[model samples]
Target: STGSATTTPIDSLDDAYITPVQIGTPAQTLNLDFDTGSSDLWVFSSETTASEVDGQTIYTPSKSTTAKLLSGATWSISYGDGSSSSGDVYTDTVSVGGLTVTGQAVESAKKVSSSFTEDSTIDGLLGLAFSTLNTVSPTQQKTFFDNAKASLDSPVFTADLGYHAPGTYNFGFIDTTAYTGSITYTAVSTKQGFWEWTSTGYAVGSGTFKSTSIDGIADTGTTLLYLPATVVSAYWAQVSGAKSSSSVGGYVFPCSATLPSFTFGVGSARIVIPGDYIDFGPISTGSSSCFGGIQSSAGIGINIFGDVALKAAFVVFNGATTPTLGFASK
Candidate 1:
């Protein structure tokens, strides 16, 4: 057996996270999520069962002659919300944009959930953050960044998304073209994983969210802001007629013309998210409601600030530098 050959079967996974991957003629590409906590690039395959694979974009690999899988490798993933799916492991000559990496890693999931099954535009996930989480026991530590670092002029990636914005998240070498200045490096505290800092409050729109005194941590893994109940509840009290709901584990406000703008202070740094990001996606009965861009994650342990706040700024995780998160402006 090859030292680098191994695959594990998984169960109960979530497909909400996805990243962009390359395929097809001239290397066509699509957006997928980079899940560092979990390692698996699962896209709904053309051969998946209907009930098992629903609400997700399916990739037809026949479009690319360069596509290849490891013949017998398999992978399964699960999440906290009970969403799960599994797929066969395959090797492919994958590329992200113009940066090509041969014999790259990928997964072809045969099962999916409503979130994945119904999404017509959502293709698949690209596990690009790190190598440790790729599989149960990853023998080879190959990550999207690891393989593509050599191609980067400075080895940097940025996540840019915002409320009312197109919510675009793209990856490529540090395009000095986007920046007006140099990238500043900040030493990341060793224990700062996701949301380990203290949060002040949240706001929507512009300067109205000027409560910039709380210590908040920016995380990519979490989807929304997990705030302290005390600060969150107190802030919601200001949101004229905003009410708490039993059906939704979070908060729910009226969907009307205009809402007051409020802001959350993160250690003197006032981060503003527009109200549109709140009601932007989709609002169904069982799904989450909108209270502008920032939400209240009262009961949750850590206060997670998602990519929305991150969209307003340029961030760089320098593995070469170690424990430092570099920041710059677009």
Candidate 2:
């Protein structure tokens, strides 16, 4: 019962990745963001206020015969970035790639923030984190991955994110062919309802690897690599003309600055993030300075190994009773 799905970056900035998912019996499709940071499968729907939805696709429950209202159920979720969404609930047949989960809780959006309504490329989000984080009222709901775990060949899932390209998300078993080097497995702590793990250390470019234990979460939902000030400052110091710009919200540098690749240790193995990946994009159109993909996580408090780091390697989320995270060079 293993399954795989395709995730493609929808925008030029590589702001996020979207995967088409089928909801309801007649099979209406909507491009959704597969997020490891949140736990709630919510969508823009007919339930969403017309004034709130722009060019985004909406899931119409009335159009599907299998859709059933989860009487009196509601959900609300907010992200670290301050964006939020909430709505009523509906149980329906949900399918992604070749996997199907019947009677899955589908959060029907009644309202979404300006940023969500303005972004037309993503219609919704399919949470892959643990169900303990589900925001459903009265009774919490299971995430797509949680519900699909029992039917999978093994309680495992893998993420192979790409830079400005389509990547693969596999459920049930790890795809041995997807990675090159051997995977380094580390115990995971789900106490905080996240795939929390620690990195052995980090190295700036080809420099020495400092024995700094960095605790962070493998967050596919986040767009940048947020590390502690020590690691972030050291990495940026290697780049000429780099500076922390409060106006731009983080580190920025001359577009022509030569950025050194970043390296982080997992067990005895280290994964390298190419310099090109860190040169996020120009801070503004026609601006000479560009934002950095790696920044300090001081504002957020907790370090986050987001898309910037995940895309550099293949990651596995093992869902056994004793959960663990595995990383491998791809």
Candidate 3:
């Protein structure tokens, strides 16, 4: 069956990609953010505080015949962006694409932070990272991909994220037509529960390649590319009137400034991010100030190849033994 599905982006915001996933016996569907950065399938639900739910569609487990309470199990998750959600647990059938996983753990939100409540478009998060990172009381839970992998033709998934456009998330197999050129592979170090790898440094514009290696994770949930402070400084230096603005919470520059192309190494494959993409739109409405998509990974230590950088390439999250990451030009 190929066990695959294509995802279309919601029109509200570019922060994250949302996809519909079916859960429970009667197959109640909900829109969830598929995040590779974390491992926990949590959703806004009827258990959530009514005032905090905003307009999100809550999962009603009482109506689902297959839903079973995990009994005293609880979960709490906080993101790098300060958004958080916590809830009780349930075991049910969860389906992604055409793959179904029975006995999948579903976290139903009883409490959610302002970031989640205010942004009503996202009803939940589908963690795509390693199951070891799953947060559940008493015992950790396996992700939907982890539970369904054995049943798949091939334990692989491809992420095709477009810039302000719809892209497909294919499971179980790779779609060759979605990307151009051969896929370049790199060994992934998953000890941290993330798809971490070493990049052989980067270059600003067409400058000489810096022979340095940096550790980073391929995060689809993150909105911008986060690099080391020095790397962030080097890229912004090329633009006139660029400054690290604390008020804006990142580097801000005049909208008229010319941005240079940024390139990074992935094994022997080099992926280049175009200049226009580097300037992540205006800071606010009717403002001449714009935000730089490349931010300093100062406190985090680990770099993040977020949507800003990921959209430039076709990504393969291979789940075979020793899990390897594959990248190709789009």
Ranking by lDDT: 2, 3, 1
**If scored against the real structure, what TM-score would every candidate get?**
0.72, 0.99, 0.96
lDDT of 1 by residue, 1-330 (tens): 000101111111111334456754446565565543344666777757767554555666667677775666666767433556676765566665446666665677777766656555556666544555555223433666666666665555555443333333334445456545666655544353322344444564443443443555556544555566665666556566566667655666666535444455444444444444344232464544443345665544445555544544555555454544555555
Q: lDDT of candidate 2?
A: 0.92
How many backbone overlaps does candidate 2 show? 0
TM-score of 1: 0.72
lDDT of each: 0.52, 0.92, 0.88
RMSD to truth, every model: 7.5, 0.8, 1.4
What would the TM-score be for candidate 2 when compared with the true structure? 0.99
Clashes of each: 34, 0, 0
How much is the lDDT of residue 128 in candidate 2? 89
User: Which stretches in model 3 have alpha-carbon errors above 4 Å?
Assistant: 10-13
True-structure Cα RMSD, model 1: 7.5
Report lDDT (Cα) of residue 326, candidate 1. 50
lDDT of 3 by residue, 1-330 (tens): 345555556552367788889999799888898889999999999999988999998899999999999998999998988889999999999988778889999999999999889977888999999988999988888998898888888898888887778787888888889888889998899999998988888999999888699889999888889999999999999999999999899999999988999999887778999887787768998788998999999997689999888888999999998799899988
